[PDB]
Write an enzyme that holds these catalytic residues in place. Sequence first.
Site, PDB file in Angstrom:
ATOM      1  N   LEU A   1       0.763  -1.248   0.000  1.00 52.24           N
ATOM      2  CA  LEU A   1       0.000   0.000   0.000  1.00 52.24           C
ATOM      3  C   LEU A   1       0.798   1.306   0.000  1.00 52.24           C
ATOM      4  CD1 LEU A   1      -3.142  -0.243   2.290  1.00 52.24           C
ATOM      5  CD2 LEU A   1      -3.014  -0.322  -0.213  1.00 52.24           C
TER       6      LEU A   1
ATOM      7  N   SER B   1       3.817  -6.985   2.181  1.00 51.55           N
ATOM      8  CA  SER B   1       2.493  -6.674   2.687  1.00 51.55           C
ATOM      9  C   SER B   1       1.400  -7.057   1.674  1.00 51.55           C
ATOM     10  CB  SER B   1       2.446  -5.175   3.028  1.00 51.55           C
ATOM     11  OG  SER B   1       1.360  -4.848   3.876  1.00 51.55           O
TER      12      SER B   1
ATOM     13  N   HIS C   1       5.705  -3.519  11.147  1.00 53.15           N
ATOM     14  CA  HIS C   1       5.262  -3.680   9.769  1.00 53.15           C
ATOM     15  C   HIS C   1       6.082  -2.864   8.736  1.00 53.15           C
ATOM     16  CE1 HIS C   1       2.801  -3.329   6.102  1.00 53.15           C
ATOM     17  NE2 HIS C   1       2.637  -4.616   6.334  1.00 53.15           N
TER      18      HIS C   1
END
EC number: 3.1.2.2
Length: 268
Positions: free
Chosen positions: A11, A77, A249
């Site tokens: 993203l 991700s 993350h």
Amino acid sequence: SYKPVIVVHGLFDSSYSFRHLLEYINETHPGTVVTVLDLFDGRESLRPLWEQVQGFREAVVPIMAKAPQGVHLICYSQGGLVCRALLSVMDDHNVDSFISLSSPQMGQYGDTDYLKWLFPTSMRSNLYRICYSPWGQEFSICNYWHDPHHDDLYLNASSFLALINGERDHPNATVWRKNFLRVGHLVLIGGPDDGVITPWQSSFFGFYDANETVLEMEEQLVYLRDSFGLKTLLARGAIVRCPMAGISHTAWHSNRTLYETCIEPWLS
């Protein structure tokens, strides 16, 4: 000396966020041709994942066609899902090591800064009210939003996750499974301190129970039924589980240690 490496970002990203990763690779496997694809970079990463699958495919085919001994994939991700679907739909890919760098492989179900910013009036238990609508399924995040409390609507509305997982029957499930099985290794990277993927175990195909109990990959139909080759891949020794506790993350593709432990070994 080394097989070509293709990187698929997540993203709101671009190849910019992978400068550290390219360094690691260059500093250990010199001469490795690494292609970090700048497709669907900023807000375009919110486009439907199936669209992204075709786009990446068009871009990846030429690279693979030139790789005599195959290529490796490092998908970060959300990118992990685009890659899994991609390896599932192309029967002629030559991907050796498929490195899933902390992806919501079994979907996402959690409140996040991005999510609150995108949907200011929703919580994780509400999102389904938006995500499982036809137009909702036109938003990348929604394509893998997995609400364990509305499993029926999910199996019904998910146009991406439920489909590539074989949770919803479709004419080509068998072929997709056959295609995904062509992979050499399914390297699963993720960890308890990733504060975004939820449950973080989604990186190891683990996911929420209807009571939000995090089941293991093996405790789910997706595995027991071998819907897309998880069981075959595991028995074959193709799945490499690589958990890590000290990475948030944002740091999975910027940590020399992680790279040396979980990535470098699989970049032949």
